[PDB]
């Protein structure tokens, strides 16, 4: 937990920057920053007004952007910051008071009805979401899915995962259930398309395994975990990160997505030698919860993707791997492969952890490291 003030009141870390003032002094809602929408609009939360507001480009610079990136958990990564036309819809903005000096951003920002530079801050903390431009799919080219990794125990591919920083991989919590919760069991293989080239010495050691604290193995609710590598990955054409999704992606009800992995290419089949990938459509949770599909097993922390006719789907071997979508010319991580009855059967689409609802936890973990 986290301490509010000197009086000793503790709150759950999930109650930190969640819109509700759980501290009498509002500390838990007084230092809240996020990136909004597919153009990464930097926004700061106002506990008084109970609302999020973009930052004016006025007097902003790279040092403020790096500070903000650190506060979000990205450590020393910084990609870019520029002023843009606000596409977030907002109607009041945060402006830097230059006359006040050396205070942190939150003490220096104030509410303003207009920005003098007529632009708001767009901030990217890491270069991500760029690539080279499973049942029912086809073999992937080098660099097509450069965030894709293969996770091994005992010289066997067990799960997939997605690179989000040089050190951090998103995967599924059920991959790392005991007795596989020990990081020393795991090796991560990046940039390699063939399982036969994933041998001792070719991969990366894992330092930490963190499962979602509300993971329920009985229902597979909150099926997400983080792996931290012992060394930073070197990025290149073949190994690069996928972007984490921002509030306000505004995805379509049946948004077009891609899944990739070494999962069996047929139910009860063996791990594919080569990386494959396929297109799937999102399926609305209300339709996924039909008595003819998963009959109320789909929780708000899950999303469905595939085709209710079947034919194309993830399978055994794909757990933890990416479900991604392209928007604003950026690839975003929308889900992690979690569960699904059979493989590619009609009325049994794939179920994925809903990464949007986990992003705040992910940031907290990266920041706490």
């Amino acid at each position, epitope marked *: 937990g986290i301490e509010c003030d000197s009086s000793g009141t503790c709150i759950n870390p999930s109650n930190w920057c969640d819109g509700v003032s759980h501290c009498p002094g509002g500390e838990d809602e007084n230092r809240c920053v996020r990136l909004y929408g597919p153009n990464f609009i930097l926004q700061v939360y106002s506990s008084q007004r109970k609302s999020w507001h973009p930052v004016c480009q006025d007097d902003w610079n790279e040092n403020y952007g790096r500070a903000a990136c650190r506060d979000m958990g990205y450590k020393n990564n910084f990609y870019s910051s520029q002023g843009i036309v606000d596409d977030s819809g907002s109607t009041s903005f945060m402006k830097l008071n230059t006359s006040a000096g050396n205070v942190d951003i939150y003490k220096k920002l104030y509410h303003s009805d207009a920005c003098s530079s007529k632009a708001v801050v767009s901030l990217r903390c890491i270069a991500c979401g760029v690539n080279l431009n499973i049942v029912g799919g086809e073999s992937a080219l080098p660099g097509a899915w450069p965030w894709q990794v293969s996770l091994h*125990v005992q010289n*066997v*591919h*067990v*799960c997939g995962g997605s690179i989000i920083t040089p050190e951090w991989i998103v995967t*599924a919590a*059920h*991959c790392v*259930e*005991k*007795p*596989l919760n020990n990081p020393w069991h795991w090796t991560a293989f990046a940039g390699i398309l063939r399982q036969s080239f994933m041998f001792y010495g070719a991969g990366y050691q894992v330092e930490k395994v963190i499962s979602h604290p509300n993971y*329920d*193995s*009985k*229902t*597979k609710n909150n*099926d997400i975990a983080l792996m931290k590598l012992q060394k930073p990955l070197t990025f290149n054409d073949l190994v690069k990160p996928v972007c984490l999704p921002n509030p306000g992606m505004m995805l379509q009800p049946e948004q077009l997505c891609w899944i990739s992995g070494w*999962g*069996a290419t047929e*139910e*009860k*089949g063996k*791990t594919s030698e080569v990386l494959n990938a396929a297109k799937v459509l999102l399926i609305e949770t209300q339709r996924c919860n039909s008595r003819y599909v*998963y*009959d*109320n*097993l789909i929780t708000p922390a899950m999303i469905c993707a595939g085709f209710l006719q079947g034919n194309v789907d*993830s*399978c*055994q*071997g*794909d*757990a*933890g791997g990416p479900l991604v979508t392209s928007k604003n010319n950026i690839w975003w991580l929308i889900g992690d*492969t*979690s*569960w*699904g*009855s*059979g*493989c590619a059967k009609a009325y049994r689409p794939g179920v994925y952890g809903n990464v949007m609802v986990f992003t705040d936890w992910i940031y907290r973990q990266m920041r706490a490291d």
Partner: nanobody, 129 residues
Framework: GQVQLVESGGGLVQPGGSLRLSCTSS????????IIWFRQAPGREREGVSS????????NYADSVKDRFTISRDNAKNVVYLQMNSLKPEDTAVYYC?????????????????????WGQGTQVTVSS
């Protein structure tokens, strides 16, 4: 709906005999669930004896029952089976099925997974002369 597991096939047999346990479900089809058979005899600790994934592609056995027991499933018939051959007095126990929503990882279902699972009512197995 929440899955409701129901085991059957237990009963009294002599040493050396066989039984076929089976488990079906109401509320939610068994096809969605990884299944662990565990057993408990009065006075002793619970013991996971066999497990199987939703697809049937990974099975798992306690050393004490390997070669004698065989787990399998039929999703179209909504049933999971435990064939138990060459039974011994030490196999006497109530046998339970435990289910979890099954994941897509490429690994066995651990035998101690009944500790967080849906459970059936159990079926008594007695092996004696």
């Amino acid at each position: 709906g929440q899955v409701q597991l129901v085991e059957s096939g237990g009963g009294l047999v002599q040493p050396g005999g066989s039984l076929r346990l089976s488990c079906t479900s109401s509320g939610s089809p068994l096809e969605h669930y990884d299944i662990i058979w565990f057993r408990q005899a009065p006075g002793r600790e619970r013991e996971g004896v066999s497990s199987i994934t939703t697809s049937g592609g990974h099975t798992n056995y306690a050393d004490s029952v390997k070669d004698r027991f065989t787990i399998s499933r039929d999703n179209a018939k909504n049933v999971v089976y435990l064939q138990m051959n060459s039974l011994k007095p030490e196999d006497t126990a109530v046998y339970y099925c435990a289910g979890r929503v099954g994941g897509r990882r490429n690994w066995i279902v651990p035998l101690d997974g009944y500790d967080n699972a849906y459970w059936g009512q159990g079926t008594q197995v007695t092996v004696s002369s």
